[PDB]
Design an enzyme around this catalytic site. Structure first.
Site, PDB file in Angstrom:
ATOM      1  N   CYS D 268       0.814  -1.213   0.000  1.00 47.51           N
ATOM      2  CA  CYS D 268       0.000   0.000   0.000  1.00 47.51           C
ATOM      3  C   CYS D 268       0.863   1.286   0.000  1.00 47.51           C
ATOM      4  O   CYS D 268       1.354   1.730  -1.038  1.00 47.51           O
ATOM      5  CB  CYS D 268      -1.040  -0.084   1.163  1.00 47.51           C
ATOM      6  SG  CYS D 268      -2.407   1.125   1.210  1.00 47.51           S
ATOM      7  N   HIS D 352      -3.886  -5.141  -0.058  1.00 41.93           N
ATOM      8  CA  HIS D 352      -3.415  -5.766   1.161  1.00 41.93           C
ATOM      9  C   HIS D 352      -3.333  -7.277   1.108  1.00 41.93           C
ATOM     10  O   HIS D 352      -4.338  -7.958   1.330  1.00 41.93           O
ATOM     11  CB  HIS D 352      -4.305  -5.351   2.330  1.00 41.93           C
ATOM     12  CG  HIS D 352      -4.164  -3.909   2.682  1.00 41.93           C
ATOM     13  ND1 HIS D 352      -3.303  -3.487   3.684  1.00 41.93           N
ATOM     14  CD2 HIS D 352      -4.784  -2.813   2.165  1.00 41.93           C
ATOM     15  CE1 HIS D 352      -3.423  -2.159   3.758  1.00 41.93           C
ATOM     16  NE2 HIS D 352      -4.305  -1.722   2.860  1.00 41.93           N
ATOM     17  N   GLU D 354      -2.267  -9.201   3.157  1.00 41.85           N
ATOM     18  CA  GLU D 354      -2.589  -9.683   4.504  1.00 41.85           C
ATOM     19  C   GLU D 354      -4.079  -9.725   4.864  1.00 41.85           C
ATOM     20  O   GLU D 354      -4.447 -10.275   5.911  1.00 41.85           O
ATOM     21  CB  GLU D 354      -1.799  -8.930   5.596  1.00 41.85           C
ATOM     22  CG  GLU D 354      -2.466  -7.646   6.110  1.00 41.85           C
ATOM     23  CD  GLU D 354      -2.440  -6.533   5.102  1.00 41.85           C
ATOM     24  OE1 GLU D 354      -1.798  -6.869   4.003  1.00 41.85           O
ATOM     25  OE2 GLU D 354      -2.977  -5.458   5.289  1.00 41.85           O
TER      26      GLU D 354
END
Ligand SMILES: [Cl-]
Ligand SMILES: [Cl-]
Ligand SMILES: [Cl-]
Ligand SMILES: [K+]
Lengths: 379, 358, 358, 379
Positions: D268, D352, D354
């Site tokens: 990001c 993202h 994650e």
């Protein structure tokens, strides 16, 4: 699980549950035997700096409502009770006690042996304490705060709660049917009373307004001169917290009023200031009087009245000046409850005539004031 | 709580109304409404241990019986109220039917939930914290044993183990504002004990008859009073255990020590535990103290007068018959039975008409 | 919500299980679950306005029936769940019997409480604020009407007064992240309207058949689809009103405009109010729009094709009977009846066996 | 009845209900299309100074829990939802949403047309707004405060949320069965990564640790020099709030890392920073990307993946330095999502990998990083 704990000066600890705001409360621990009237009690300015214990185990059965507030806020420093009921159950309730307490940021604890506390206080006398509501409440800390508290003896509190600016009050007493009435137009009240706010209770004024008296509330430290200049129909001395003795300003002024012929009436602290200003002495009670079933004799007429009491200081009868005559005495313990100036139109009561909460037995005391005012007006 | 005797009046309308039908009453004192109430249920002598269930949970018709019982109050309404909560009814629903203030209702519902937890957790889960909390709400060891599927005696032993006993408070008229020299006490689960029992005298404990009912009245109280009077006069410290408000026996004047408590094994043993009386009398308060006799004795209580066993010889109709037989006295043609079939068989012999005597 | 036809299969087991028994299904869209659910209830066509009651409040056996219906699901469960809340059962009590997540339950309980308020305050209490709140939770004018003991047309009027009309949102697959040029909309009570109706052309409204069911199935979808295909081809702007998901008619390719809504008077009137169509077809969606005809026309709707009076001549058995007569045509020996006694009497005349045709 | 109001810079008002703390909130208003993972969203630092609006009407259905916190606190400036459920119903729940919001002292509103708001933002692009929750919220004051908002344009927020002192992380990912695992012993971690804290999500760390790294979190402003000095097996650049542009320090330093052969990874913001450090340009998007249904193409394998997005800014593709090669693009608007250094062992992802919350699709992006690392180790 929300821990709370109350530690007294002597080191005694009461472990319970937090029912109010998180944090700590410190002050003088007292006990009140009133079975009803908790809100009125809480919002009573006379409690400023006091941690209030209620003897009746279930506190909050009726929730709260604004009509039952005796001042703008809750003055009691903390609240201690045995049981906080699951629900409030009353048509007049607008907020459960717990929410009420949090909203007023009041530290309170429930689920403790209030009777044990009570017995201790009754037996060993008033103590100061500290309540700590929060995660891991620290006893040593509460202890230290309770021991570090300065003590109410000699503490002037009237100055702390009094009105910044002076004001007018023209509202009367509540009714089931009506509720709290609308303020009265000045022209509607024959009389004009100047009331010294030593931390006064709304009912006192409402009850005065009820008698057709128009009120002007003034800060406690208001000069007699300043006051005189208003041409009062009579003066009134409000109840209020802490030691009345250190209130030089009010005593002095009072002395002044007494040189005149204006009728004066004081209640509780007012009663004390007035005695003081007449050359009498005050002493701090062992545990004081707090409850609403207190028998008081009208020695003149040899009649009893059940009264509302909330006092930790009392006037010494023995030191009483000859110009001061005793009008009332506690039936519980014999302490002084009422006095009248032999020479001037001035009298006061130790108990609370306006009640709220409590019995209405004392209300007539007011009427006597009103008689005095009328007669001054004749003159 | 009022005491009824409808079972004695078969064809009687047993719904409560504006014309009284109760025969007596029980009274309880507790630091809280829940504690007070539970103590009263158990002091009523109707065989309850608190809020014993009246209907089965797996009864399909149950919600209909309950509603009936709630809407049209009979003497057992109080139990049906807790049954309603066990069945899923709300405080509002129950209120609507009964008109009993929710202030009260919520408290009963709360007890019901606690019961449910105990059932689930069983004895194993009855930790000192929990146990204490339950005792604080007026739970009887017996009700708790019922729920945990154990013997009442086990709960009691547990409490002991946890050193969990009640404290005694005193009545004084003034919420402690003043001291009292009288000893009119009641139990509770709290911090400070105000019992302060003597060590000085020889104590005799008298067990009262609880609420008045048909067949057990004022006569029993009259005796209890006399026992108290006579012994005190003789120089014994007298201790009365009773919970009938209508009585002289519950009058502070009557004894040296008065425990205004349920006449239950639990309640009495707790008293005995601190008083350590010289003797306890169980023959002057009716059936109730008589039924407890054996249990008290078993529990170490110095019961005086005719023994629980001797009592048993008379109270137990087979033992008695026996004795009569032993003395070569005259009795009518009889038999002692436990099952209908045997009784049916047993009756042809004896002969009609016959008298069924429990 | 599934659509059942248990009434056509008397001796059948009507309890829901792992084998399918339903015949159709309705779908609804709402900004909230409450809104969604209520719309579906009224979109099902089983006579519901939403949560109409199944049992009486003053029926002793009521909790028992409720119990059963909850414990052992029937097609009627949803309505019983509301009845359970009216009857005093808690969310928990309901969960235990149903196993339906409390997330849903509380929602239904809340609508019930709102319903009880309407019943208390009545039509007078229907202030704009409240009424608005009610419309937002999906309440139908018709349900409000029964509760307020007034006529549905009165609520609708009240709504008018207040300026309480729904807005239309659009289906777009992305939560408004991107614009859509398709007009697939659903009604809701909110701020912004995305209806953006044409002023451009002559519109034709086709009313769908709702959920499939025995007797009214796919045939009616096929006809609807064709009417749209036809007219559209003919230059008309075509609007479809239906809420059966398994249909081609509820396909966005199908018409110019698609209102995925319950086929009710209220719902149709709202669209009409905004579409201002040239005409409406009530003849291609089964019994539904057929029954709505009169009310629609009476409410200013421009019904095309066979008239509502005309439909009634055919739909009303007595009227049909006349027509045959007036035409000097042959029909069996018959009579039209409203009450048993009379029916019985007339039957004697006609003679058995005989066919009962509502 | 508790009011709340949301006012946009443009004057548009949304009246509704207060569901969090009392007060006001100001920020850039954004819409998020996630149907689940509202708590994770709330505790995402990249949301700092942002008033988050959720498209899915019912928000709070599952309550909240600590494991669902992506940071130590709530970063969102405000919360805007359509409906706050009556109850929370999930076994993992520990606190209902309202309570949680209040506890975190978050001003939040409910009952407004979120859809209309969404359409507005999407139509006319991001706007700043103000939420006032309280007795009589002042619409003109709200506007004023909104209007007065500075703008995240050119706002370095990274510095504001970053850690004070660098630290070590060795904690793994959550499991249904085990929940959040116990931290690992450094010795159990082969690799050693250095992470710049630009306002990083815990899930990044956990997933890293998950892949055998022992972490050392450093403040955003830490010097490359200081960095290099620990001999990291790989460096990582976290997510975070504000403009990436203004972050000269981090830019500078990254430039310094790209002179060395250390593998680098940016998520990001980190993506934007690295692109910056490579001489590329960053823009502020019309409304940005906020959801968990975003299709992204791995141009290289011509494979699509659904991702978790949250970004108001982007990297200009038509200004990309040749050394910069595009690995990924957004299938919704063709925006740049991933880049790699032609020359170096440095790459990044705009979204993202994650998740938390969101699809697990892009998690392999981590694996690349582990390849890059074991390779530098071989070296
Ligand atoms: Cl079947
Ligand atoms: Cl209203
Ligand atoms: Cl809005
Ligand atoms: K609104």
């Amino acid at each position: 699980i929300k821990s709370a704990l109350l530690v007294l000066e002597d080191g005694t600890q009461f472990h319970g549950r937090a029912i109010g705001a998180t944090g700590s409360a410190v002050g003088e621990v007292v006990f009140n035997t009133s079975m009803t009237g908790y809100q009125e009690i809480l919002t009573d300015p006379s409690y400023s700096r006091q941690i209030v214990t209620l003897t009746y185990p279930h506190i909050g059965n009726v929730g709260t409502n604004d009509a039952d507030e005796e001042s703008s806020q809750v003055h009691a420093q903390g609240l201690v009770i045995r049981d906080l009921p699951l629900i409030a159950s009353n048509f007049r309730n607008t907020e459960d006690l717990s929410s009420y307490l949090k909203r007023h940021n009041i530290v309170a604890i429930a689920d403790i042996d209030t009777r044990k506390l009570t017995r201790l206080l009754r037996e060993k006398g008033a103590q100061n304490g500290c309540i700590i509501a929060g995660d891991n409440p620290d006893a040593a800390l509460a202890l230290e705060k309770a021991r570090a508290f300065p003590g109410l003896n000699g503490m002037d509190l009237a100055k702390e709660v009094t009105t910044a600016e002076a004001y007018s009050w023209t509202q009367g007493s509540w009714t089931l049917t009506g509720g709290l009435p609308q303020a009265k137009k000045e022209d509607e009240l024959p009389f004009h009373v100047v009331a010294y706010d030593f931390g006064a209770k709304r009912n006192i004024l409402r009850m005065l307004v009820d008698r057709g008296c128009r009120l002007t509330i003034v800060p406690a430290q208001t000069s007699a001169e300043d006051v005189l200049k208003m041409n009062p129909d009579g003066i009134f001395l409000s109840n209020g917290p802490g030691d009345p003795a250190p209130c030089d300003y009010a005593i002095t002024a009072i002395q002044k009023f007494l040189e005149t012929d204006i009728p004066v009436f004081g209640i509780c602290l007012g009663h004390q200031l007035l005695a003081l200003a007449s050359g009498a002495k005050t002493v701090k009670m062992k545990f004081g009087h707090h409850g609403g079933n207190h028998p008081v004799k009208d020695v003149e007429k040899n009649v009893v009245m059940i009264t509302a009491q909330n006092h930790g200081f009392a006037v010494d009868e023995a030191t009483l000046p000859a110009n001061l005559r005793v009008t009332h005495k506690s039936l519980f313990d014999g302490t002084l409850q009422g006095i009248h100036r032999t020479d001037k139109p001035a009298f006061s009561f130790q108990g609370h005539p306006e009640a709220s909460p409590g019995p209405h037995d004392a209300a007539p005391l007011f009427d006597h004031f009103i008689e005095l005012i009328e007669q001054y007006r004749k003159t | 709580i009022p005491r009824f005797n409808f079972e004695k009046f078969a064809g009687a309308n047993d719904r409560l109304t504006t014309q009284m039908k109760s025969v007596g009453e029980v009274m309880a004192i507790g630091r809280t409404q829940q504690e007070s109430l539970q103590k009263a249920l158990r002091g009523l002598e109707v065989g309850a241990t608190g809020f014993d269930p009246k209907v089965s949970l797996d009864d399909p018709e149950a919600l209909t019986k309950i509603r009936r019982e709630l809407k049209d109050a009979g003497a057992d309404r109080i139990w049906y109220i807790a049954d309603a909560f066990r069945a899923g009814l709300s405080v509002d629903g129950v209120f609507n039917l009964t008109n009993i203030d929710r202030w009260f209702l919520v408290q009963i519902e709360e007890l019901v939930r606690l019961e449910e937890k105990v059932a689930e957790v069983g004895i194993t889960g009855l930790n000192a914290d929990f146990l204490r909390q339950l005792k604080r709400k007026g739970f009887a060891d017996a009700r708790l044993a019922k729920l945990a599927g154990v013997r009442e005696a086990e709960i009691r032993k547990l409490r002991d183990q946890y050193d969990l006993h009640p404290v005694y408070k005193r009545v004084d008229t003034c919420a402690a504002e003043f001291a009292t020299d009288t000893a009119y006490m009641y139990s509770t689960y709290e911090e400070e004990c105000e019992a302060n029992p003597s060590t000085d005298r020889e104590k005799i404990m008298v067990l009262g008859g609880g609420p008045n009912r048909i067949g057990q009245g004022i006569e029993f109280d009259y005796c209890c009073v006399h026992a108290s009077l006579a012994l005190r006069e003789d120089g014994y410290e007298t201790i009365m255990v009773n919970c009938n408000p209508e009585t002289v026996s519950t009058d502070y004047d009557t004894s040296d020590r008065l425990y205004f408590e349920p006449v239950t094994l639990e309640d009495v043993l707790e008293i005995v535990r601190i008083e350590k009386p010289k003797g306890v009398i169980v023959q002057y308060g009716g059936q109730t103290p008589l039924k407890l006799a054996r249990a008290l004795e078993a529990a170490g209580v110095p019961v005086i007068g005719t023994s629980p066993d001797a009592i048993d010889r008379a109270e137990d109709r087979e033992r008695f018959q026996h004795a009569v037989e032993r003395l070569k006295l005259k009795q009518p043609a009889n038999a002692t039975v436990t099952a209908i079939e045997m009784a049916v068989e047993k009756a042809k012999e004896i002969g009609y008409p016959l008298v069924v005597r429990p």
